[PDB]
Tab-separated table of C-alpha atoms in Angstrom:
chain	number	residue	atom	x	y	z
A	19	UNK	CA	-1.938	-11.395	21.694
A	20	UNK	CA	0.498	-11.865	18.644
A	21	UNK	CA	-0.632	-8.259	16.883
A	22	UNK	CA	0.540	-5.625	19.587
A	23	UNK	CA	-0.859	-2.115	20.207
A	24	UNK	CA	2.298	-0.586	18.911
A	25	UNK	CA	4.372	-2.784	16.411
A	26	UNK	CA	7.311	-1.670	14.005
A	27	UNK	CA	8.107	-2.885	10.222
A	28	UNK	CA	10.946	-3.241	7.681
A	29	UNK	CA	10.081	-3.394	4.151
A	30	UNK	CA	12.208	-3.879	0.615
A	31	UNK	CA	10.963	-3.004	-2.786
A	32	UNK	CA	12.286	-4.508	-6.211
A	33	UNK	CA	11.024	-2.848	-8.664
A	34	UNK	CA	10.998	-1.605	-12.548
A	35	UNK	CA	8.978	0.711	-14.055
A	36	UNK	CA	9.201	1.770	-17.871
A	37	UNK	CA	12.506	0.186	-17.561
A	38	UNK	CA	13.775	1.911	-15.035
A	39	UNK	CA	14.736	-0.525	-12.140
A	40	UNK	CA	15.830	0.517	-8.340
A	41	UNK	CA	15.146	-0.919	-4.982
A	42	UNK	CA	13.662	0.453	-1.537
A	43	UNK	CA	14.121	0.252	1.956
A	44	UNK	CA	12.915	1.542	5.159
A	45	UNK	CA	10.700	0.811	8.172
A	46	UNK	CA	7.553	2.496	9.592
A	47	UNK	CA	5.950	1.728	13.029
A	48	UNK	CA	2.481	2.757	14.123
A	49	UNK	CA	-0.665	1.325	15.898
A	50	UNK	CA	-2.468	-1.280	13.912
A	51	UNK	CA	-5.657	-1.682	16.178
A	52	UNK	CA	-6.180	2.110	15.836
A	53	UNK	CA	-5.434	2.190	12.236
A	54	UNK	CA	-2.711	4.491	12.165
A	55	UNK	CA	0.857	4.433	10.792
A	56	UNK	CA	3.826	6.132	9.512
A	57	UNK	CA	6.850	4.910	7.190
A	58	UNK	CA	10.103	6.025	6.476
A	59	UNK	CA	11.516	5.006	2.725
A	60	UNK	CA	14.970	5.422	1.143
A	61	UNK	CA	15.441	4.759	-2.812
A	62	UNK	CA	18.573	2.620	-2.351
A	63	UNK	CA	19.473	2.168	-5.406
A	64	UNK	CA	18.331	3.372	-8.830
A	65	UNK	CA	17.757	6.816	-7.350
A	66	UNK	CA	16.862	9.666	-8.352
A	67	UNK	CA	13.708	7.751	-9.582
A	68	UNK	CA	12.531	9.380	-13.481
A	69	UNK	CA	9.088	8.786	-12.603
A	70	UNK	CA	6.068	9.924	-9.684
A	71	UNK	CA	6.584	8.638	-6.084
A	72	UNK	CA	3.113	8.061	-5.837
A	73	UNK	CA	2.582	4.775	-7.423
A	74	UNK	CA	5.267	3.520	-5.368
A	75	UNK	CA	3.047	5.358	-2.406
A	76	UNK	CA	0.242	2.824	-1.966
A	77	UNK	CA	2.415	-0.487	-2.098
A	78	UNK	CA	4.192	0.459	0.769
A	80	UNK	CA	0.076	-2.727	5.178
A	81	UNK	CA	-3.202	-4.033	5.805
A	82	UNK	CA	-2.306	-5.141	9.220
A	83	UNK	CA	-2.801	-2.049	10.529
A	84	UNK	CA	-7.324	-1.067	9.566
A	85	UNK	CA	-8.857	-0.566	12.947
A	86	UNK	CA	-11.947	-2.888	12.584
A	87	UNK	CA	-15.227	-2.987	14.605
A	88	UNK	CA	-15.564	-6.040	16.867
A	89	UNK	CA	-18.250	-7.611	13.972
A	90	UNK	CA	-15.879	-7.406	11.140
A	91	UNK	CA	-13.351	-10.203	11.434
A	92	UNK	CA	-9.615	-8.685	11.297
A	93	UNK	CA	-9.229	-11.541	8.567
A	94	UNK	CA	-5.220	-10.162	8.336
A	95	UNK	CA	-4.158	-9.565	11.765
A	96	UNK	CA	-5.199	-13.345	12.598
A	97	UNK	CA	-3.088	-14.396	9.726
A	98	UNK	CA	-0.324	-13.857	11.919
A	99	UNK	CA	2.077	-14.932	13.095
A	100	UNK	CA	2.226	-16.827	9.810
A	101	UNK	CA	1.287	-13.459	8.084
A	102	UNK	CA	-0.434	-13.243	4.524
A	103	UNK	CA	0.428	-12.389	0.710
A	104	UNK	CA	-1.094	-10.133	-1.654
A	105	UNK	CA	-1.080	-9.180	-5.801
A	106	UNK	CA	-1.985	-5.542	-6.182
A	107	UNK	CA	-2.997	-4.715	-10.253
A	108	UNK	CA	-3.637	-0.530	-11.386
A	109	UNK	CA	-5.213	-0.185	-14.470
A	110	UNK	CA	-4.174	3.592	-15.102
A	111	UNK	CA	-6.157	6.023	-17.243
A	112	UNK	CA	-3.501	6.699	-20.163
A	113	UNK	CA	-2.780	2.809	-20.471
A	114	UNK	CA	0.086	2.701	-17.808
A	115	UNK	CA	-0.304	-0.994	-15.755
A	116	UNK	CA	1.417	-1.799	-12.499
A	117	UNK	CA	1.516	-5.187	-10.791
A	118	UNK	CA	2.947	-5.770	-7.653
A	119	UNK	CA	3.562	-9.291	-5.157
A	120	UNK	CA	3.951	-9.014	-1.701
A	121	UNK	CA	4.584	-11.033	1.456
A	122	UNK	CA	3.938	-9.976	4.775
A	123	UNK	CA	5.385	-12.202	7.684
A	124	UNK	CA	6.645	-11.404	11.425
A	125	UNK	CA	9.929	-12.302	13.272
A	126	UNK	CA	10.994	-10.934	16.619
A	127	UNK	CA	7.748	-9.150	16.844
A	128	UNK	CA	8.472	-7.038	14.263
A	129	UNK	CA	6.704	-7.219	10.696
A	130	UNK	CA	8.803	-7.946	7.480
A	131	UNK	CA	7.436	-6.850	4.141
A	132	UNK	CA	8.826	-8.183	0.702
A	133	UNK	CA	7.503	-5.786	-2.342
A	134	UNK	CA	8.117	-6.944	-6.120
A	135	UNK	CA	6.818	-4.056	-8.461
A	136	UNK	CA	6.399	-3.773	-12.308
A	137	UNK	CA	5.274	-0.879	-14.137
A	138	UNK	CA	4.979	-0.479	-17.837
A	139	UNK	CA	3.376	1.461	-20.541
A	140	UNK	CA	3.184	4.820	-18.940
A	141	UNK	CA	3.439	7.290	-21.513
A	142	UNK	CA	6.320	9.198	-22.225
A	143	UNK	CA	4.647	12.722	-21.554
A	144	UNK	CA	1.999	11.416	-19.481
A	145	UNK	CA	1.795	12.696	-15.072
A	146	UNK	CA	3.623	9.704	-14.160
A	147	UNK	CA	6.788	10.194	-15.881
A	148	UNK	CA	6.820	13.667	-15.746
A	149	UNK	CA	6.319	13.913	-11.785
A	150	UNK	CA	3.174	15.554	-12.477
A	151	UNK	CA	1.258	13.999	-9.469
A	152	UNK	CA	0.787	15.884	-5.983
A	153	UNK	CA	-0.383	12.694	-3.529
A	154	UNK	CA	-3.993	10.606	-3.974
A	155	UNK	CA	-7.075	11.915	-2.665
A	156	UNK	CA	-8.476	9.622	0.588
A	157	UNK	CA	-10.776	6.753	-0.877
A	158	UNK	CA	-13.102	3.797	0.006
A	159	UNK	CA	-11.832	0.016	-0.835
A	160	UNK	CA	-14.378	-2.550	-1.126
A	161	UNK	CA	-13.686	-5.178	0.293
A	162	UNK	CA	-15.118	-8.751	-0.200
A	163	UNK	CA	-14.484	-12.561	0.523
A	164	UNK	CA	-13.809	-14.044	-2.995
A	165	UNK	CA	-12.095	-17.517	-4.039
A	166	UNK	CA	-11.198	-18.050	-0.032
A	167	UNK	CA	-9.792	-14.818	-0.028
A	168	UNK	CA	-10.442	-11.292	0.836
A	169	UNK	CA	-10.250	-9.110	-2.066
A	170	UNK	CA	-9.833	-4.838	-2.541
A	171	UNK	CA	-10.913	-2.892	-5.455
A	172	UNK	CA	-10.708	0.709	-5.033
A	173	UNK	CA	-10.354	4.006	-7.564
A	174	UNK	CA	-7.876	5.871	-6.866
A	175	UNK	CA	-7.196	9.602	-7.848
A	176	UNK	CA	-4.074	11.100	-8.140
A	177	UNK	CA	-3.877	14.914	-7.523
A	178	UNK	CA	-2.826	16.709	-10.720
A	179	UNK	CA	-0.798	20.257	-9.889
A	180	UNK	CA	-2.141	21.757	-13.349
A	181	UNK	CA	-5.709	21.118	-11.439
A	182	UNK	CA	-7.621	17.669	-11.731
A	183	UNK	CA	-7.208	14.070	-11.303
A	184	UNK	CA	-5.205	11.237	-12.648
A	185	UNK	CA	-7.232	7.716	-11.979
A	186	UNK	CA	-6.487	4.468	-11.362
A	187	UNK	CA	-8.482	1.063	-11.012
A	188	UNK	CA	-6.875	-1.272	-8.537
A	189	UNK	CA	-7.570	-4.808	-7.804
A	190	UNK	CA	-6.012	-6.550	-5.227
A	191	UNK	CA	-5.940	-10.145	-3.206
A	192	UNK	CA	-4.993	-10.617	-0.243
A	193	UNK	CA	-4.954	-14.082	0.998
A	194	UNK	CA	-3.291	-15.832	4.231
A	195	UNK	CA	-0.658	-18.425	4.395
A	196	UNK	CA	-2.954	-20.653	6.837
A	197	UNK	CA	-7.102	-20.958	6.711
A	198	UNK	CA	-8.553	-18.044	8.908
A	199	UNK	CA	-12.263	-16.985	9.064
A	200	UNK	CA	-12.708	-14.074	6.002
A	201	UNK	CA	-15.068	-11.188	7.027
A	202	UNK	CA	-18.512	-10.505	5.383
A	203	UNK	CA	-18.120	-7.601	2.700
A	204	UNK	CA	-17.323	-4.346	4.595
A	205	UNK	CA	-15.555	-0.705	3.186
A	206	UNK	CA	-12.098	0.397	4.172
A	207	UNK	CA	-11.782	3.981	4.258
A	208	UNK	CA	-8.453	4.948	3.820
A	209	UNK	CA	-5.885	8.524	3.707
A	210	UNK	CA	-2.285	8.763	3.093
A	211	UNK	CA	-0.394	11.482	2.767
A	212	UNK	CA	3.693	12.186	2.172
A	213	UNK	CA	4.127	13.939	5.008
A	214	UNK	CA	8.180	14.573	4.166
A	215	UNK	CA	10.411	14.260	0.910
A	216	UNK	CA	14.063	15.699	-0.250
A	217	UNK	CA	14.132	17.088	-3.594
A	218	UNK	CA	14.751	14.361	-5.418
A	219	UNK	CA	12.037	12.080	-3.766
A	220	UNK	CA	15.165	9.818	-2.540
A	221	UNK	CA	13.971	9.920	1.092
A	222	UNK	CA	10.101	9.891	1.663
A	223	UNK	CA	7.763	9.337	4.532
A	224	UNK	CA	4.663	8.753	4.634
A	225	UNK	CA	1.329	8.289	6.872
A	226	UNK	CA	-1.553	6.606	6.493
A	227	UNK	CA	-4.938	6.066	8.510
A	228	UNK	CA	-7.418	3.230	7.135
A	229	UNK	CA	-10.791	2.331	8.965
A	230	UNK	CA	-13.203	-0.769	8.125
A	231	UNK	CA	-16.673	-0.093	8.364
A	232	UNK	CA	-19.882	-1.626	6.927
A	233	UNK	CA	-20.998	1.634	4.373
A	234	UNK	CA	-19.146	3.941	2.459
């Protein structure tokens, strides 16, 4: 009805992190009851950015997790009206980022609204020394919480000297009107940049995420 098979989105990013600041823009499109997408980003100012793409990666859309018919699709029936979220990583080396977001729709079209902090990421450490190589597909658990639905997944960052680089994330997501939250299900999701110039100052990415009731 509102949610289409095939719907298109804009998204900006204001962000800082380690002092940095810049902004993003771009738009991405893909198929949100198959749970499938694609973005296109361009660092608009602030660029080239001192620091890995990849925790930028994950902030830039929950509306589109295919879901079986018996888990309620708590965020597409947000919409029109749409839904917020707070995203928190808890990095392994002591590096934090927070990040606010609103997700609305005009003209049938999605319209995303990213804040972003980051802070405490050490000097030498993978994320200020581009030392990261994309995040490995994970599981987030999801669960109703405080009348909203709520994420907390690991994820681990590819290190090109072999390993990982972790981080615990914690997010909310929560819609602007009352709208029936699901029973505590998994979202398995992959993303991958699929395309980047050399300085990381235009990026796309793709992403496929899946609710299901196990791991």
């Amino acid at each position: 009805a509102i949610i289409k098979e095939f719907m298109r989105f804009k998204v900006h990013m204001e962000g800082s992190v380690n002092g940095h600041e810049f902004e993003i823009e771009g738009e991405g499109e893909g198929r949100p009851y198959e749970g499938t997408q694609t973005a296109k980003l361009k660092v608009t100012k602030g660029g080239p950015l001192p620091f890995a793409w990849d925790i930028l990666s994950l902030q830039f859309s929950k509306a589109y997790v295919k879901h079986p018919a018996d888990i309620p699709d708590y965020l597409k029936l947000s919409f029109p009206e749409g839904f917020k979220w707070e995203r928190v990583m808890n990095f392994e080396d002591g590096g934090v980022v927070t990040v606010t977001q609103d997700s609305s729709l005009q003209d049938g079209e999605f319209i995303y609204k990213v804040k972003l902090h980051g802070t405490n990421f050490p000097s030498d450490g993978p994320v200020m020394q581009k030392k990261t190589m994309g995040s490995e597909a994970s599981s987030e658990r999801m669960y109703p919480e405080d009348g909203a639905l709520k994420g907390e997944v690991k994820v681990r960052f590819k290190l090109k000297d072999g390993g990982h680089y972790v981080a615990e994330v914690k997010t909310t997501y929560k819609a602007k009107k009352p709208v029936q939250l699901p029973g505590a299900y998994y979202a398995n999701i992959k993303m991958d940049i699929t395309s980047h110039n050399e300085d990381y100052t235009i990026v796309e990415q793709y992403e496929r995420c899946e609710g299901r009731h196990s791991t």
